[model samples]
Target chain A: SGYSRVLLKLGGEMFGGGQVGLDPDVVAQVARQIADVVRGGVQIAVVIGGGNFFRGAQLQQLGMERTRSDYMGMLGTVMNSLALQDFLEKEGIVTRVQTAITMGQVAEPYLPLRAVRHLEKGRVVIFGAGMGLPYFSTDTTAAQRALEIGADVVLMAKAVDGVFAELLTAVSHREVLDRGLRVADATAFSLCMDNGMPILVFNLLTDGNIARAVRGEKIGTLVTT
Target chain B: SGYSRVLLKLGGEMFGGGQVGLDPDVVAQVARQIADVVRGGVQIAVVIGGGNFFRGAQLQQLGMERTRSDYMGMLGTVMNSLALQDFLEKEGIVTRVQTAITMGQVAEPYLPLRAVRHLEKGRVVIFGAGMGLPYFSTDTTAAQRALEIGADVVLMAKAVDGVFAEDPAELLTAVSHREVLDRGLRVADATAFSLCMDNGMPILVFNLLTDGNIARAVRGEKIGTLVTT
Candidate 1:
């Protein structure tokens, strides 16, 4: 069947169009697809990573504290969230950017209950600022947000096609974590494994694939709990 | 020597002008006093209560869940915060309203370290939304925030004077449980009292009606009940 609520996890690098900073073309395209699927009445919430801004590793090498660097990365995610918000509004889809780190002039604070209300009202809630803690990945935020807001699944859009894992258009959550067979998208895999949440790993390179994934078409790896 | 940083705790009831909504005059007056104190090189952070909005007791009597009602209460405090923030700006003082529930367009989210930085830079950081939890009071938020941000004292302004046991100031951490306080002036709301007492944070219970009393409290003068460990 189809999902009523979907949490879309997008990489920060994808927003940068394979370079540094935001890529207008990539964001516009992604927003267009999101607009398309959302109009079909499926509620969508997004959790974006800060990889496109700058790598924490490089900053850590430069002697920046990991916690402070993590805060900087979170700020990048907000910028990305705003860009997507602008593009989505242009697509005529109402969007809300709820951040974990409260910047009142910009967006809403991360309130899970209000977020569900946003989705119910047909607004796309973009969750910014990862887990609001150091060392937790965007995947963790996605997993946690999806669970808290009662999302049916997590749509992970990566650059490459589905991971080179055991076929069957699906991967066992246990096999991926325990057997070292993983796409290595970070700790989110373990979260999905522990909970009964399903994760759809699909290719963002191909246009219209996002729509197909929403329709439950088996184009990418679908790992269910 | 006087303290550099202080956390002011005001109740929502005093903000309503004896009604259920905000009284602009009261907020305006409070902002002026706060502005005066801050201009004198004292760092002030306010944690105001939400009783000016609908009372949770009334709502719960009508059958709403406690947790949901608690969230509603927190949102009310943000309104008080923004109102203070606006008037403070009018007084030519910069202010930041940080909320626990995190309404993006309204104010900043509560971050303790950033709050400290704001104080150091002389901007008044108003913490709204209580502790962002049910069964907790704004007094608790004031105490905890004061502790975390290294505030020297908590200035609790109420319509009435200090507790019945005393002022000019007597030791309030010494007051027993039989006090039966009102005006939310009963600064001894278990959690708030415990944090301040254990961590050596001072609580000043002063009458807001007396003009310049807030400044007097900041100067460590004997205007109100100064409860210290």
Candidate 2:
């Protein structure tokens, strides 16, 4: 396996599983898979989406202000980060949650050098709080983290198997090579695509698919840098 | 009337009118009153509670992990800070928000010197996001901020008239030296309380209901002080 390390981005909705809140079982399954990968000596870092428990878009209908709603969503991501941290630890895997927002009493603040240290020590680090600002998705976060940490590829674990190019726009579940289908949100896709970061879209539920992708088995649709 | 500076603490719950969220009108009303005091030549610094938007205690009851719940509550305080900031600025009052935890993009990080400068320029500064840690309350925040920023008194503003000797604590609204109570809350949290009690700082408690009490207190009219050295 040429890939020794990777960055994985999971959508916030995936954690909810057709519901509007966290599903511990779903989180646990993801954790278990990641733990297995770690056991195989591959360094992994995860960015979990917070929209599963609370979506900012929904807050607008509740008459909540935009800034407040965005902040509330950031907290939701911290909650998910903490949950994943706990579950991952239970499996004898050490994990760290570095929040973009400084909540010193709970998790470590977003310190780039320290995050790299954690990864180097063979520990999994989860980035939460989404750049600590509004109008950005965790997709951009993964892209930014990938660039900062020098990850060779960005693994987008999606529900779809691969990038299905309608030939013009970036489509969901489809990996685009040479800028065919964009998986990231509009702004985020533009940023990542322009930078030539590889994006892999694969169905995470598939058995052995994660390890297979790590082994370069082409289990998911692959995008090239 | 002899006080030159004061610290005011307002609960986020009051802003929400007993609901579990922000009530803009309530914020506007309070800000209007505060702006009047700032323009009246009184140096005013405020600390607000975040109970309205987030109930950390409730999160624990719902089985949230302790540290996670604390972080969530911290974010809630930031939300309240931003709301009050919006309203305060709406009244044409220039203000500053220094978070104990640094959320640089949202507001200026906590810097004591900058706070004093703002006050010197006759701007009202609002301190929020409290102590940046679990186990510290806004009451403690006011005391600490008062000492660090070198305020003469920590003005504790609440719906109640003033700190009582007892629960229905006798409302000794007089200016007697005995009406002052040491910040017992601060004592328990070292870093926060040490800044105040170690310096023999005074904590003033007064009724926020009185229209000009904030300015009057700053003028040394002695509207509130639960403790004095």
True contacts kept of each: 0.09, 0.15
lDDT of 1 by residue, A1-225 (tens): 677889999888668887655566788888998998889888999998877654445545654445545655665576577667767887899998898877554567788999999999999999987766767788888998889999998888887777674544887787667667655465787787789889888886688888788887887888886
lDDT of 2 at A40: 77
lDDT of 1 at A107: 66
Backbone clashes in model 1: 5
Residues A1-225 of candidate 2: C-alpha lDDT, one tens digit per residue: 547778888777556665545566777777787787788788788887877644556655654556756766776677668767766876789998898877665678898888888888999999988788876778888888887887767888876676555522133322343444445566556656677766777767665667777777756666664
Q: What local lDDT does model 1 show for residue B5?
A: 94
DockQ, every prediction: 0.05, 0.16
- Quality of candidate 1 docking, DockQ: 0.05
Native-to-model Cα distance after best TM-score fit, residue A86 in candidate 1, in Å: 0.6
Poorest 10 consecutive residues by lDDT, candidate 1 chain A: A56-65
Tens digit of per-residue lDDT, candidate 1, span B17-75: 66655566787788788899989999989997877764445545654445545654665
TM-score of chain A as modeled in candidate 2: 0.88
Candidate 2 lDDT by residue in tens digits, B147-194? 788887776666666765545435555442322323222212354345
* Chain B TM-score of every predicted model: 0.88, 0.84
Highest-scoring model, TM-score: 2
